[PDB]
Design a protein around this ligand. Structure first.
Ligand SMILES: Nc1ncnc2c1ncn2[C@@H]1O[C@H](COP(=O)(O)OP(=O)(O)OP(O)(O)=S)[C@@H](O)[C@H]1O
Ligand SMILES: Nc1ncnc2c1ncn2[C@@H]1O[C@H](COP(=O)(O)OP(=O)(O)OP(O)(O)=S)[C@@H](O)[C@H]1O
Ligand SMILES: Nc1ncnc2c1ncn2[C@@H]1O[C@H](COP(=O)(O)OP(=O)(O)O)[C@@H](O)[C@H]1O
Ligand SMILES: [Mg+2]
Ligand SMILES: [Mg+2]
Lengths: 348, 316, 261, 152, 327, 258
């Protein structure tokens, strides 16, 4: 069993970072009229830790007894779509963004179905029940309009906890009626604290300097930090400060992509780097993640008078990739513009 | 109760069609021979796909046309039961036909049919091909699946070159003795844009509307933005002049023109304008971007002003 | 004050089942001569005129004319509350939003009060002129209903031709042809089963079969149907509703293109 | 009483103004019986329905208006169903009273899909000598070029 | 009883309870004697009480006997479907009763339908609403409630009477929130109340919901600035001073540090655009610098409205405020 | 060991389409008194008590108290194999997982044996108290099905009121109102066509019409139905299946206020 999820907290008092938000949420769920929640922050900050912790504090013992159900829905076109559901006897958890263009269909039908379902022995447990919408940000406009309709009509019997990142694409009038809970990414010292705790439980003597290296290469992402710690334990048990940390294959692939860019400024190297971009894109990783990795591994090389225009073109081609439908044209346009600007930079 | 000119001057034989000369000649070779393969005819509207398929079916069958030819169309219902029943038991039927002549199912506007309709189509046209042959008509081949274009012979009809449109127009005009001016007839070409039925209807319409066929009468009964005004607009955008082009913009906006038609005529004039090739490419890209601004729902005069500003700044 | 009593009760039900799917809203024009109705379909192809005379009602009295908007689906449900032998009394006010129908048992044991809310409609009274017809054919109701019910399986249209041999109903569809002939019958023991044809000029017209199938749900109203057909004249389908009135239909014929082949 | 927009819908070809060329061409079409299918396009509120309704009331009396004019728009459901419903059923049949062509008035005609436009343009070709359509639309550019190649 | 939120609980109820909106009372008071009115459209920020004003207004025009029979109230964001626009309004106008009451008072014979929050509808739904208003212009009158003007389309606003609803602008909300705090026994100082007014631009309902949320988190503790800054979606001011200190002079390493230190905190980039715009338009920068920074803030908010990545765009925005601040 | 033979088998078929739509699975409880079905609907509104007495059967053997929970849709499917005149045999042992259904011809030329799979159900027996009902109206079940069917078209519920003028059924909806009224009939030729009102206190109550339409599929069983009402209690509707037994349906009245 991995220690990333084995030593996960259960109660709100055994949290390692953001104690004040933990106390605020504990006193919020201590009284009645628990409102609609919109939890947000960066990836790996620990939103879902707060969410199952809130579910632990809201209910009794049976909060981690989860199972997968499969529910079929019908589009206006005659086609059956099977959707997945992570559910318990006290709550619901749905990812509704897996259905791309039929997100309004599932957002109407599935929560109409669970709203029309009656809580058996409702006097014993609590007043209402909670529904998690795990990936909610990339839902489209009228899907989120049906979502706020669902929030309005079953306000007495079904409150929702929407979890996402980058709420700019989340519509305004769902943010008005939802209590906004913001979970920041843990700092370098809090990541070092929880790494030292997860090593002290498992009989380990991690030096502080290697914990700083793990925190600074995890880029404020605790799950990735604990996975690096696990992989470092697998690689070598005697821990030295000068330790080779096993970085993930797509980051070092982006590093090789970036040094293939800065090596040559010719169309043949552009063909090679377009092949590398295709190999990166075929693994179903998001192109904004590729863009961010390219800019992070690109700013370690370029001169100080050229970082600003490079960053502006990075934002420009990420935005036009979001407006478009095929990623490789905008990505290789960004790479071609960077090569043209760099060869103008060293040519003069 | 006189018939309109679109149906009165429809061709009755396959050599009166001026659309695609090699395809028409091969269709006549198949009409005199008999073993016509499964064909699909694609192209823009007005090229004469319907009259080519109808003339091929007539010259094949002759007196047995009323029983050996099934014309299914867009105004009829084309559900799953229709391709299950009507097309199937037409393809299963027997007609006493000659040695080379074959049954014909004229499927006009096949791009508008549903996917299950084509799913029930495919087996039928592969199996019953010893007796019935499918002559599909369509506008865009993208809405039709690739297997139907595979089992058919695809016949791309081009947009008509203006010379054959002129020859048919002198044929109709000499058949009616309608007076004309030359530049008015070129205005009828400009209003046609590869749509020959549109040219005939606009000429028809215009003569019934106002005697002499002159640029003023056809441009009055059509009321598109004038080519001279939009061409002078693009010329004023070439030499980096926002103001002189904006009097033409205010002239075309106080005349009550919708922005969609303004940007469509802007692109259509910019297609054939005599300017630098890379400059024409940049102009077409900016006109396309403003056309997405229009199509997304921003139809202000300021979008035209910003289009003029972007065309002005792209010429230094 | 609109009180109108009708003893034979299911005849209004058959009148309504004739209007059941052919029309969804209609206006009742009420005068001292009685009840009038003139409406069209939503497609504006078929015209329906319904006339119920004053003397056919049991106790009819009506002080002022009434234009009354009716949804025939609502009283299609309400007249299904009426029995076959029940007595129907219709009651309305001069400025009513309401309509009252009282269903009474023949032994005066069961009494029923039913209310319908009325809707406003714009009325276009299309004055039908009196025209002499080239052909007038009276035939059984069940026979004509069977004629359209068989010929609606073959095709969607019928070609009806009246000539010196008689009347011919033809159909041509994807299954094949169909031609049913009827001749003038000299002697029947009953007057309700004979086909009797009066003529000036032989006619031939094509009609949609959905409309005729909607028309011939008025079969139990009358035992005999009068089809008045002529060139440039619609197909008049007259049912004589006993001695209390008449139900008349008007179908425009279809366009037949002329082909030399 | 009513708002002033509905109280003064020009009922006569005399009351309306600033559309004199459309007036002259349409009356010239309708007096000599050379009226084609019409497609009236422009901005909202410039009197598209008023002139065609006054022309249809100029042709026919009030006692025969119900069988020679069918009015539809987008308040009803519009698509592939109602083109195969009331429209061609009105268009393919004759007149219950007298003789002459018919009229279908379709307000806000730019709101239908192009499949419905293809069905309607084939309906326009099939029945022309007995039916004269009238399509009122806001934008011309929402209409397929073959439909603009049918109706003036 | 159920815990009622204090927005609809504390809304006005009568015609004269509207807190100085006597023009909206007077136009109708004229319409009572005139017995005729066109379509209405009330636009304004929420919590003002447009819905309660038109409910009491229709109660004055019809009475409690005719209120449940002649007034149909629908929420447009609850009825965004094109079917329920084109069916329920048709069924309401088709079922007609007379305009005569049992009290003997005169009454105008047209119906009343209300569509609340109609600005959230799309273009096609609003076009279908325009069609429903077009065909039902004789027997049913239309009134709409919205918060913004241009979200309602031009054909929908061309057939209605537009009424601006002004809220409690200044110096009334603070003591009102003090009465709510003393009624529910809530301890909150003057600066917290002033910050509650300041975080919502003219919005009462936002202030009541933020006070409800802060009292729910504290549960009886002091409402400090940190809790209100957390709930109201405010970046703390020291983060903006750190951003301006990093972008004033130095290298791109400190910007990347503060941008990656602003995304990590969980802050929305649109909130940075709003607050950075607020601190640029009020500071003592040059006009060219203020102009370039604010134009880029507008472009960044555009692309964040289009769903672009916040990280790269905050990098580019901080890069151009660095290139404008260092020079 | 439980065997039952009944000479008229269409009455159990009529029982079957009386409750194959109301309830999906039912527990049959047989003791020496006979067969009882006290079942409870899925939407938590209606109770059904069907009892069949011992003396009406031709022959009857029952050893122990038994409770078999059978799906009535499937056993409605198996009784559709039987005719309207055949004598019916039901067999089940003390630990029976199966139910044997034997349909025999009156002339004994056709004897049919079929098997039914049985399932276990957790059954709660609701104690129905013996109480004095205020109002008892006896009327024709064909007219009662006619009442439910013609009032179901108007609205979703009926407010029915009984008083000294007789019984009264009222329904309201978007089409309008319906108001039927029955009085005490004095002279009849047949007692099954009479209407009899036993009165204690005039009462008004509102009930949903879906369950009334469901209950009026038992009207070929009895020529008369009995509608019994009182204050704050479930409505009793009652069919007398011959001298064989009875069919009582308990309806929860609608107490929803605006
Ligand atoms: N090549 C041609 N030569 C002569 N007349 C033509 C030609 N093409 C079209 N026409 C005329 O235009 C009319 C319409 O032609 P159609 O074949 O119906 O157009 P189409 O190819 O079917 O395109 P659609 O159906 O509108 S997409 C015919 O009746 C002819 O009078
Ligand atoms: N030329 C005109 N002269 C006089 N009144 C006019 C004129 N044009 C419009 N009107 C008035 O405008 C009112 C509305 O006209 P409509 O024909 O209904 O508008 P429209 O052209 O159909 O545009 P729509 O229906 O919104 S697409 C009429 O009732 C007239 O009172
Ligand atoms: N106090 C803590 N102790 C141990 N692990 C923690 C703690 N807080 C966060 N984590 C770890 O950080 C990871 C954050 O993942 P998750 O909750 O999914 O965040 P996100 O939803 O943003 O990806 C979790 O896997 C969890 O194990
Ligand atoms: Mg074609
Ligand atoms: Mg109009």
């Amino acid at each position: 069993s991995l220690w990333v999820d084995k030593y996960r907290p259960c109660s709100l008092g055994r949290l390692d970072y953001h104690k004040e938000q933990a106390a605020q949420l504990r006193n919020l769920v201590q009284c009645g009229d628990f409102p609609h929640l919109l939890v947000y922050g960066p990836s790996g900050a620990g939103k879902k830790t707060r969410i199952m912790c809130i579910l632990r504090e809201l209910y009794g013992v049976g909060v981690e007894k989860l199972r997968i159900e499969h529910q079929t829905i019908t589009t206006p076109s005659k086609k059956k779509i099977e959707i997945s559901t992570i559910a318990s006897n006290y709550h619901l958890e749905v990812n509704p963004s897996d259905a791309g263009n039929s997100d309004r269909v599932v957002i109407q039908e599935m929560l109409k179905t669970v709203a029309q379902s009656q809580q058996l022995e409702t006097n014993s447990q609590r007043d209402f029940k909670v529904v998690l919408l795990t990936e909610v940000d990339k839902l489209t406009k009228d899907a989120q309009h049906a979502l706020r309709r669902t929030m309005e009509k079953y306000m007495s019997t079904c409150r929702l906890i929407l979890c996402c990142n980058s709420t700019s694409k989340v519509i305004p009038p769902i943010r008005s009626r939802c209590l906004a809970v913001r979970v920041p990414a843990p700092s370098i010292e809090d990541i070092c604290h929880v790494l030292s705790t997860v090593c002290k439980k498992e009989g380990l003597n991690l030096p502080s300097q290697l914990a700083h290296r793990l925190a600074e290469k995890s880029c404020r992402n605790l799950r990735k930090a604990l996975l690096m710690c696990e992989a470092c334990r697998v690689q070598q048990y005697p821990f030295t400060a000068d330790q080779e940390i096993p970085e993930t294959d797509w980051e070092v692939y982006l590093r090789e992509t970036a040094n293939a860019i800065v090596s040559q400024q010719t169309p043949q190297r552009l063909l090679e780097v377009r092949g590398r971009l295709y190999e990166l894109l075929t693994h179903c990783i998001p192109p904004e993640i590729i863009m961010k990795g390219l800019l992070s591994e690109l700013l370690h090389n370029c001169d100080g008078q050229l970082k600003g225009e490079v960053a502006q073109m990075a934002a420009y081609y990420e935005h036009r990739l979001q407006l478009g439908s095929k990623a490789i044209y905008h990505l290789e346009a960004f790479v071609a513009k960077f090569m043209a600007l760099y060869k103008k930079f060293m040519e003069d | 109760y006189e018939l309109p000119w679109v149906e009165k001057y429809r061709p009755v034989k396959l050599n009166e069609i001026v659309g695609n000369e090699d395809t028409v000649s091969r269709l006549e070779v198949f009409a005199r021979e008999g073993n016509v393969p499964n064909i699909i005819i694609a192209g823009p509207p007005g090229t004469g796909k319907t009259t080519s398929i109808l003339c091929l079916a007539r010259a094949l069958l002759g007196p047995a046309l009323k029983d050996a030819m099934l014309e299914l169309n867009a105004s009829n219902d084309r559900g799953i039961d229709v391709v299950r029943n009507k097309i199937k038991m037409f393809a299963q039927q027997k007609v006493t036909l000659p040695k080379g002549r074959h049954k014909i199912i004229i499927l006009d506007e096949a791009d508008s049919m549903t996917d299950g309709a084509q799913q029930a189509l495919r087996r039928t046209m592969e199996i019953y091909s010893k007796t019935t042959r499918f002559a599909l008509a369509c506008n865009a081949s993208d809405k039709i699946i690739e297997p139907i274009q595979s089992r058919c012979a695809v016949l791309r009809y081009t947009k008509l070159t203006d010379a054959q449109i002129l020859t048919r127009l002198m044929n109709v005009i000499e058949k009616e003795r309608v007076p004309y001016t030359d530049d008015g007839l070129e205005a009828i070409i400009f209003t046609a844009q590869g749509d020959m039925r549109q040219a005939l209807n606009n000429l028809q319409s215009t003569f019934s509307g106002f005697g002499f066929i002159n640029s003023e009468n056809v441009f009055k009964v059509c009321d598109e933005p004038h080519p001279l005004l939009v061409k002078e607009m693009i010329q004023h955008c070439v030499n980096a002049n926002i103001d002189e082009a904006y009097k033409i913009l205010a002239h075309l906006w106080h005349l009550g023109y919708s922005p969609e038609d303004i940007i469509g005529n802007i692109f259509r004039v910019c297609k054939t304008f005599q300017m630098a090739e890379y400059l024409k490419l940049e102009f077409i890209k900016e006109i396309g971007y403003t056309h997405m601004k229009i199509a997304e729902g921003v139809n202000s005069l300021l979008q035209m002003a910003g289009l003029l500003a972007r065309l002005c700044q792209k010429t230094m | 004050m609109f009180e109108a009593r009708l003893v034979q009760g299911s005849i209004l039900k058959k009148v309504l089942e004739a209007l059941k799917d052919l029309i969804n809203e209609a206006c009742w024009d009420i005068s001292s001569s009685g009840v009038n109705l003139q409406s069209m379909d939503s497609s504006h192809v078929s015209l329906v005129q319904l006339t119920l005379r004053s003397e056919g009602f049991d106790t009819y009295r009506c002080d002022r004319n009434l234009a009354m908007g009716v949804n025939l689906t609502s009283m299609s449900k309400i007249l299904k509350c009426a029995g076959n032998e029940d007595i129907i009394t219709l009651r309305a006010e001069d400025n009513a939003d309401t309509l009252a129908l009282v269903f009474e048992a023949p032994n005066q044991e069961k009494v029923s009060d039913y209310e319908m809310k009325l809707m406003d409609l714009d009325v276009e009274q299309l004055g039908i002129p009196e025209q002499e017809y080239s052909c007038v054919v009276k035939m059984p109701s069940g026979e004509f209903a069977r004629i359209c019910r068989d010929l609606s399986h073959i095709g969607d249209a019928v070609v009806i031709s009246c000539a010196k041999d008689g009347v011919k109903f033809s159909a041509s569809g994807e299954l094949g042809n169909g031609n049913i002939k009827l001749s003038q019958t000299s002697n029947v023991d009953k007057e309700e089963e004979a086909v009797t044809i009066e003529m000036n000029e032989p006619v031939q017209l094509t009609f949609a079969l959905r409309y005729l199938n909607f028309f011939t749900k008025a079969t139990p109203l009358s035992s005999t149907v009068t089809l008045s057909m002529s060139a440039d004249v619609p197909l008049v389908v007259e049912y004589k509703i006993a001695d209390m009135g008449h139900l008349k239909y008007y179908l425009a014929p279809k366009i037949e293109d002329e082909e030399g082949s | 009483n009513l708002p002033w927009v509905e109280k003064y819908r020009p009922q006569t070809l005399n009351d309306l103004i600033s559309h004199q060329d459309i007036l002259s061409t349409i009356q010239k079409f309708i007096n000599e019986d050379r009226l084609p299918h019409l497609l009236l396009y422009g901005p909202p509120g410039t009197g598209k329905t008023s002139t065609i309704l006054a022309c249809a009331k100029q042709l026919y009396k009030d006692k025969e208006f119900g069988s020679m004019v069918l009015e539809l728009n987008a308040s009803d459901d519009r698509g592939i169903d109602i083109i195969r419903g009331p429209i061609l059923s009105f268009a393919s049949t004759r007149t219950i009273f007298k003789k002459g062509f018919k009229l279908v008035i379709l307000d806000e005609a730019d709101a239908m899909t192009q499949d419905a436009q293809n069905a309607l343009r084939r309906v326009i070709e099939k029945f022309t000598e007995n039916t004269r359509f009238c399509l009122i639309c806001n934008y011309l550019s929402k209409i397929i070029p073959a439909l603009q190649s049918r109706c003036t | 009883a159920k815990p009622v939120p204090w927005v609809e609980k504390y809304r006005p109820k009568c015609v004269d309870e509207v807190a100085f909106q006597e023009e909206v009372v007077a136009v109708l008071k004229k319409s009572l004697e005139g017995a005729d009115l066109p379509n209405l459209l009330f636009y304004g920020p929420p919590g003002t009480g447009k819905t309660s004003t038109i409910l009491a207004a229709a109660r004055e025009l019809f009475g409690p006997e005719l209120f449940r029979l002649r007034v149909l109230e629908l929420n447009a964001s609850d009825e965004r479907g094109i079917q329920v626009v084109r069916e329920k309004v048709k069924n309401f106008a088709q079922l007609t009763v007379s305009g005569s009451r049992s009290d003997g008072k005169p009454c105008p014979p047209f119906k009343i339908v209300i569509l609340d929050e109609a600005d959230s509808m799309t273009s096609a739904a609003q076009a279908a609403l325009r069609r429903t208003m077009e065909k039902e212009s004789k027997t049913t009158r239309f009134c709409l409630i919205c918060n913004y003007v241009s979200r309602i389309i031009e054909p929908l606003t061309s057939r209605c009477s537009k009424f601006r609803f002004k809220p409690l602008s200044d110096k009334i909300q603070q003591q009102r929130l003090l009465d709510i705090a003393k009624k529910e026994n809530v301890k909150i100082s003057d600066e917290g109340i002033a910050y509650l007014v300041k975080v919502s631009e003219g919005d009462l309902r936002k202030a009541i919901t933020f006070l409800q949320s802060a009292t729910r988190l504290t549960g009886g503790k002091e409402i400090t600035e940190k809790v209100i800054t957390d709930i109201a979606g405010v970046i703390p001011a020291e983060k903006i001073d750190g951003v301006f200190a990093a972008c004033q002079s130095g290298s791109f390493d400190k910007l990347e540090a503060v941008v990656k230190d602003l995304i990590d905190e969980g802050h929305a980039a649109t909130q940075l655009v709003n607050q950075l715009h607020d601190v640029v338009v009020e500071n003592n920068l040059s006009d060219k610098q203020k102009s370039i920074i604010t134009e880029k803030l507008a472009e960044v908010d555009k692309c964040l409205a289009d769903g672009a990545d916040e990280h790269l765009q905050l990098i580019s925005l901080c890069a151009t405020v660095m290139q404008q601040l260092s020079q």
